[PDB]
Amino acid sequence: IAEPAMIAECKTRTEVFEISRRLIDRTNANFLVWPPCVEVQRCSGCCNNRNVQCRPTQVQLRPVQVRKIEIVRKKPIFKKATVTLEDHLACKCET
Amino acid sequence: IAEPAMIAECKTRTEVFEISRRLIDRTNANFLVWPPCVEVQRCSGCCNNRNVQCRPTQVQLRPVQVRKIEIVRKKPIFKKATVTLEDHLACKCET
DNA sequence: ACGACACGCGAAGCG
DNA sequence: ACGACACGCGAAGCG
Ligand SMILES: [Mg+2]
Ligand SMILES: [Mg+2]
Ligand code: NA
Ligand code: NA
Prior knowledge:
Two copies of one chain form a homodimer.
Chain A: E1 3-4, E2 11-18, H1 21-24, E3 31-34, E4 37-44, E5 53-72, E6 75-94
Bound molecules: magnesium ion (2 copies) and sodium ion (NA) (2 copies).
The structure holds two DNA strands.
Organism (chains A, B): Homo sapiens (Human)
Protein name (chains A, B): Platelet-derived growth factor subunit B
Subcellular location (chains A, B): Secreted
């Protein structure tokens, strides 16, 4: 059977966010971070027409702790860094 | 508090698929389709290193019925078209 | 392709 | 930046 197609409504869905090393440190390259990606909630889906787009109406900042290794003459220095994620909490179709 | 960052594992998540008018009809432009987008399941997330990527291991074809209006001298002709969606069912990190 | 339907909403039906 | 840990797995601890 072929079921009726259902519109993907404008709402929050779980997406994959890649953790930016550049925001962790823009002035040094000598480091590794873990994990490289986390889940975030994001507004996606399609509105009625192309005069409007699916956009967040409230966003929530969420700090997470990442693992950082600084490499100094081939030796690891273990540190922690805090990345502030942005979660979409609600969406609307917006002009 | 800043919770520990958790890796976004390579697995299936719900994504938004935009319905291609071109696959519905490549030889005529005189038509509209509804809905413009549907949910599908897709492999996403991050593997251990950049020598591997998150890829589907089994995919399931899923036909859905879309609404089509053919416009002929400004009058609508109501038709149905069948679009075959591809859902990801499982994923692995692959080299 | 230039924002039918007694209306408004969504070869529709309801109130 | 050139694939520590008695090992293998993941300034680790377990078996
Ligand atoms: Mg009537
Ligand atoms: Mg020991
Ligand atoms: Na009507
Ligand atoms: Na050890």
